C-alpha cells in the first residue's frame, strides 16, 4: 500500500504489464511491492474480471457451431467455447459466460441469477465488471446461502437483492405462504423485471429422481423440470415447494442466458431453448456438436 | 524546621516535576527513604497530590469508569462525541477494535442488523479473514445484512437465516422457525462465542404499532424485541411472536455480547439494555454516556 | 484446416482464459512454439487481442497516460474525481505519496501556501520526521503556512520567510527582500531538491485587481504570480513587484516541482502552468484531467 | 495503534498508571504495546503537559517568599519554585510557569508570548493544556522562526497568530514601515488584546552592551530595556528597530507573567515589577531570596 487500496494496485499492475509491456519484477519495485504479490494480483485481476481480454474476431468461439445454433434455435446470442481435454468444464464455461455478459450488460442494468456451480462460477469472473458498471443483482430463487459463493466476491457498494427464503419449503402450503410475505413478494417482482438473466441447466433426491425420469423430464432450470418438447413437467411435488421465479415468469426477462455444458447435458440444453426459457447460450464445443447431432435424428 | 505538609509539597515537586528518585530526595533533605515513601503515601493519601489529565479523552475515560461501575460491564469504550462529528463511523471503528480484543481465532460471531453494526462489521473485515472468524445472523432480514457481510476469505463461513425479519403472523413465524433451513441457523447462533448488536429507541413497524409499544411501556429494542426501563422484555406485544430470530433470553446465553449505540435520545434505551443484561459490553459516544449517566 | 485468424483466436482463448503455456498450446495444436509466438505477436499486432480493464481507476490511468505524453511530465497522478467526493482531502493524500517517492532522506522541500498544499503537508508529516526532511517556505505570509508546518521531529528544521506575502508597495517589497532575515530564506529556498505548489485560477487581491489581471490576460497563478494561457508570466502586473517570495523563474530552477490542483474551473490554469514549465509533476482529479485534456 | 492515535494512548497510559495504580509493563499488554513505548509515552505526557500533577497546598512553592513578594510588589500571582543544585533553571522554571498558567487560563482565552528559552520552555510544558482548552496564542514580538521551538509542539488545530516580521529590522525606518503593513498591524492589535501574557526577562550585540550598561539599563523585556526605577531607557537605537508590542502596550494585558530566574536576574526582575510590566512572577527560591535581599538595601 503506497497508498493504494487493492483494486488500484490490480488495475495498475494490469496497465503496466499489458499497455506498457513491463517486466513482472520490474513492475514490483515501481509500485513498491513484493514480486510474489505482483504475481498474485495479476491472477486476481483475471479471476475476478478486472482484467478483460477480448478476442475481437468472428472466430472467438467455434463459429461453425455458433451459427448453426442461432439458426436452429433462434438465439439472440451464442458462444461455444473451444474444447479442452479433462478441463474443469464448470470453470471454463465460467470465463466464457462472464465475457459474453460483459458484452451484453449496459451500465446500471439488472442481472437476475440462478444457483449452481456454473452460474456462481460466472459471477466470480464478473465481479470486476459488476461493480465497475454498477450492475444490480437479484436472486431468481430462494436459497440465500447457496448464492454466497458468487456474491461474497463483491464490494459492499453493489446492490444485491436476495429473496429472503430457502430454495424449497418443506410442503407446498408453506411455500405458498412464503410467496405472499411482502418481503418475498417484493424481490420476486424485482427478479421478473430484470434486463438479463443468467442460469445453469441441470440434466437428468434419490427416491424422486426415478419418478422424474418416469414423467420424461429431460432437464431442470432453477429447480423446475421440463420434457424434451420443452414444456414444464406437470404433477411433480417440487414445483409447488420451490420459492422463486417460475419458468413462465423467467420468460419476461428480455435476454436470458443459459450456461451449461457436459456430456449428459446436450438434450436438456436443447429442450431448454425449445421451451423458450433461454434465448442465449454459452456451452463448449463437444456439447455444441452433441446438440446438433441430436437434431439430425 | 518544616511542617509535615511543607515536606509533603517539597517531595511532590521533586518527584513529579523534577522527576528525581526517592534515593535522591531522601539523600538531599536528609530524611529516610522509609519516611519519604510514607510521606508520598500521605500526599496522595488525601488532598494534596492530585493527578489531572489535559485532553478530550479524559471525559471518555471518566464516563468509561462510571459506566463500568454503575452497570458492572465487562468492557466499555467511550469515544469522543459530536466534537469530532463522524460519530456514526467512528462508533464502528470502536466496536471493531473491541471485538478484535475479544475474538480468538476460529470463533463464531453472532450478528445483529442495523447501521452501527453493519458499519462495525465493515471495519472488522480484515480480522475476520486472517483470523478465520465465523459469522451468524441473529435475525432474519437477509438483505439488511448484505452491506456488512460484504467480503470473503474463500475459507470464511457466513450463516444467514433464510427468512424475513418479521412474519405477517405469529403462526407463519412459528412454522418458519420450524423449517430446518432456518432452525439450523438459529441453533448455530446461540453457540456463538461473542455477539454484536445495536440498540433501538422508541421500517418494519407501523407508526401505530410503535405508539402502542410506547404505551405498553417500551423504552428500546434489541433485535426487534422491546424492553421497559427496568430491562424486562415487554409483554403483550404481538411483534414478538412474529419475529424470526434468537430471543433475548437465548441472546443472554452468549458469554460476551457487545452493544454499539449512538444518539442522544438513545440513553434511556441503552441504560435499560444493560439493566436487562442483554449486553455486558458497550461502545458509545461521550455525549450519550453523559445522558446515560445523568439518568441515574 | 484452420484460417490464420481462426488459429489466432484459439491461441488467445487458451493463453488468456485457460492460462495454458505455449509449450502446451504448440504441443496440443501440433504447431511450433516459434509459430505460436509469432501468432500471438500477430493477434496483438493488430485488431484481435485487446486488453480492457474494468474499474473506475482505468480512466485515471488513461488521463495519466495522456497528460504524461501531452505535457511531457516527469510524474502524474490522477485520482478519482467527484465520484468519491472527498476530492480535496484525497488530493492531499495523493501528493504526499508522490512526494514520498521523490524525497531522499535529508533533502529539502520548498513549500507553497494554499489548502491543497497545507493539506498534503499534513498527510506527509510522518515521512518528514522519520526521513529528516527540511522545509522552506516559497513565499511570505507566515500564518498561512501554520496549519501545515504543524508538528516536529525536534531535529527537523523549518525555514519560514518572516514577511507578509505581499507588500503594500514595490519599494517596501524591495527593501524587505534585502533584509537578510528574509534573504537567507529566499536563498535557502532555491537550493531545494523538490518543490510543492498549488495552482490558482482567475484574499490578498481586490475584486478590481483581479478583474484587471484577467483583462491583461491572466489565466492562473502560482505563488501569487500570474501567467497567460501560453504559460508566460503576465507582464504589467503591479502585484508581481509587491510579492515577497521566490520568482517563478527561480522556481523553475528546482529539479522536480509538483503541483496539486482540483477544481473543474482550474483546467485552463493547470494546462498553462505546465506549458510554462512551472511544474513537471502533477496531482489532480479525473474530472479536471478530462477538462484539461478537452482544452487541447 | 489499536486503533488509537498517540494522544489517546498517552491519556490512557496516564489513567492506568495513576488512577488505577497498574504496573508499567502490565499496562503494556493491556493496550497491546511494547514496554519501552509505555515508558516513553508516560514521559511525553509529562513533558507536553497532558499529565498535570497539581500539589494542592499553600506550600506548593516557597510560601514565605511568595507572600513577601505579593506584599512588596503588589502581585496578582506568584510562584517561587523550590531550589535545586546545578539544575537547568531554564527547564525548572518551565514546569512551574506552565503549571501556574494552567491555573489562570480560562477555556478559549488568549495567551500572548515572548521569545526566549524560558518562555519557549513553558510553552512546551503547556501544549497538552493549550489544545485541550483551545487556548489561542499570539506572538508579542517579531521573529517568526524563534518561536518555532514552542509552537512546533502543537496540533494544526490550535490558533497560533504570528507577527509576520523579523524580531528587529535593520534600521528604524524599515521597522516603522513594517509596523504599518496591514498584516503586522493586525497581529500587533491582536497581541495587545490578550488575556494573559507570558514573557522572559533578560538581565544586563557586543558593542551595544557596554553602551546599554552606560545608560543604566538593568534588564530587558521583549527586547526593550529599562532602568532600576523600572522606566524604559531612552535613546537606545534598538527600541525603534524592534517589530513587536512596545512595553507601554504590554500593560494593556490584564495579567502578564514573567518567568525568570538565575543568579544575575534578581535586580532586573525587581525593576520589571516596579515598572509595572509584569504583575505575576514565576522564579526559583535562590532568586526570590536575592530579590528580597536587594530590597533591604
Amino acid at each position: 500500500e503506497q497508498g493504494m487500496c487493492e483494486e488500484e494496485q490490480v488495475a495498475r499492475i494490469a496497465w503496466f504489464y499489458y499497455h506498457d509491456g513491463l517486466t513482472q519484477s520490474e513492475i514490483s519495485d515501481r509500485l513498491g511491492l513484493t514480486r510474489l504479490k505482483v504475481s498474485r494480483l495479476l491472477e486476481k485481476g483475471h479471476q475476478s474480471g478486472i482484467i478483460r481480454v477480448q478476442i475481437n474476431s468472428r472466430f472467438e468461439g467455434c463459429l461453425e457451431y455458433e451459427t448453426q445454433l442461432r439458426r436452429q434455435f433462434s438465439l439472440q446470442h451464442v458462444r461455444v467455447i473451444p474444447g479442452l481435454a479433462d478441463a474443469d468444464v464448470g470453470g471454463r464455461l465460467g470465463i466464457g459466460a462472464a465475457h459474453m455478459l460483459m458484452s451484453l450488460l449496459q451500465p446500471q442494468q439488472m442481472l437476475a441469477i440462478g444457483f449452481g456451480e456454473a452460474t456462481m462460477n460466472t459471477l466470480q469472473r464478473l465481479s470486476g465488471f459488476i461493480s465497475s458498471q454498477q450492475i444490480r443483482l437479484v436472486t431468481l430463487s430462494g436459497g440465500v446461502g447457496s448464492y454466497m459463493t458468487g456474491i461474497g466476491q463483491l464490494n459492499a457498494a453493489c446492490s444485491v437483492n436476495i429473496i429472503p427464503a430457502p430454495l424449497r419449503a418443506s410442503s407446498a402450503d408453506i411455500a405458498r405462504t412464503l410467496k405472499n410475505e411482502n418481503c418475498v413478494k417484493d424481490v420476486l417482482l424485482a427478479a421478473q423485471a430484470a434486463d438479463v438473466a443468467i442460469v445453469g441447466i441441470g440434466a437428468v433426491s434419490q427416491g424422486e429422481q426415478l419418478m422424474i425420469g418416469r414423467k420424461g423430464a429431460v432437464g431442470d432450470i432453477l429447480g423446475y423440470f421440463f420434457d424434451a418438447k420443452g414444456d414444464v413437467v406437470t404433477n411433480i411435488k417440487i414445483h409447488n415447494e420451490l420459492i422463486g421465479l417460475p419458468l413462465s415468469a423467467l420468460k419476461t426477462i428480455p435476454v436470458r442466458v443459459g450456461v451449461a455444458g457436459g456430456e449428459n447435458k446436450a438434450e436438456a440444453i436443447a429442450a431448454a431453448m425449445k421451451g423458450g426459457y433461454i434465448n442465449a447460450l454459452v456451452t463448449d464445443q463437444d456439447t455444441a456438436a452433441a446438440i446438433l447431432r441430436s437434431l439430425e435424428h
Side-chain angles (χ1 to χ4, degrees), chain A:
Chain A
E1 230 184 314
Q2 75 150 208
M4 313 173 312
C5 66
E6 249 213 73
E7 203 175 353
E8 193 174 343
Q9 309 194 344
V10 160
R12 288 203 131 90
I13 282 153
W15 197 282
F16 282 64
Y17 180 101
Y18 291 111
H19 289 248
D20 302 330
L22 263 145
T23 288
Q24 39 262 263
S25 71
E26 276 194 322
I27 286 155
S28 177
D29 187 41
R30 200 145 150 185
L31 288 169
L33 296 153
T34 152
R35 176 185 203 172
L36 263 204
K37 196 167 173 178
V38 165
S39 180
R40 242 181 225 149
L41 300 197
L42 226 182
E43 284 172 357
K44 200 161 186 196
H46 278 295
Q47 299 208 344
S48 84
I50 313 285
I51 312 174
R52 165 202 204 165
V53 204
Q54 53 205 312
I55 290 99
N56 293 320
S57 90
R58 80 215 331 121
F59 301 117
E60 251 210 309
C62 312
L63 166 62
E64 348 82 28
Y65 291 154
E66 280 162 6
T67 147
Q68 265 150 96
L69 261 6
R70 329 187 61 97
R71 200 152 260 120
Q72 291 311 311
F73 290 104
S74 272
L75 303 181
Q76 280 194 231
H77 304 88
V78 206
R79 175 103 296 122
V80 173
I81 73 172
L84 262 192
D86 325 330
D88 187 46
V89 194
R92 273 177 37 82
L93 248 36
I95 296 95
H99 279 253
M100 166 159 133
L101 278 172
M102 292 186 185
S103 306
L104 260 56
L105 283 164
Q106 305 316 304
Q108 327 211 112
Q109 285 193 314
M110 218 200 312
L111 176 72
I113 55 164
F115 51 98
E117 263 300 290
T119 337
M120 258 31 273
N121 226 286
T122 284
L123 253 32
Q124 281 170 24
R125 320 279 311 202
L126 225 215
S127 29
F129 187 88
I130 292 181
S131 46
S132 124
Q133 318 273 311
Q134 282 169 99
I135 308 301
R136 285 170 295 174
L137 306 187
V138 197
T139 62
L140 279 168
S141 81
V144 169
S146 46
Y147 288 89
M148 285 315 300
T149 33
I151 66 173
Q153 308 289 187
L154 320 172
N155 291 51
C158 314
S159 161
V160 49
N161 189 7
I162 313 281
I163 294 171
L167 191 249
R168 177 201 208 188
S170 56
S171 93
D173 302 278
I174 286 151
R176 207 151 45 240
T177 286
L178 275 156
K179 303 251 247 193
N180 301 319
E181 285 313 277
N182 286 319
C183 274
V184 176
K185 215 149 62 158
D186 197 356
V187 201
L188 246 21
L189 284 168
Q192 185 165 13
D195 284 307
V196 177
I198 207 264
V199 294
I201 298 149
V204 75
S205 322
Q206 300 146 59
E208 300 177 275
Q209 283 161 70
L210 291 160
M211 282 317 292
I212 278 106
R214 169 109 251 254
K215 273 104 157 184
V218 153
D220 102 89
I221 282 166
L222 299 167
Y224 298 87
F225 292 90
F226 42 82
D227 56 45
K229 211 165 286 159
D231 349 333
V232 37
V233 193
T234 181
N235 287 294
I236 306 173
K237 282 147 194 192
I238 310 161
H239 296 207
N240 310 317
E241 280 176 19
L242 256 14
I243 324 288
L245 217 58
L247 297 202
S248 35
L250 178 69
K251 282 195 196 191
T252 311
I253 299 164
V255 26
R256 38 205 140 59
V257 11
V259 48
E263 339 144 46
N264 283 140
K265 296 288 185 79
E267 342 192 298
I269 302 167
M273 19 192 202
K274 274 155 182 127
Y277 304 128
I278 57 161
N279 59 20
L281 165 59
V282 180
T283 15
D284 68 286
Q285 186 164 348
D286 317 70
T287 315
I291 293 172
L292 298 168
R293 267 194 287 283
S294 160
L295 270 206
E296 298 173 317
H297 243 235

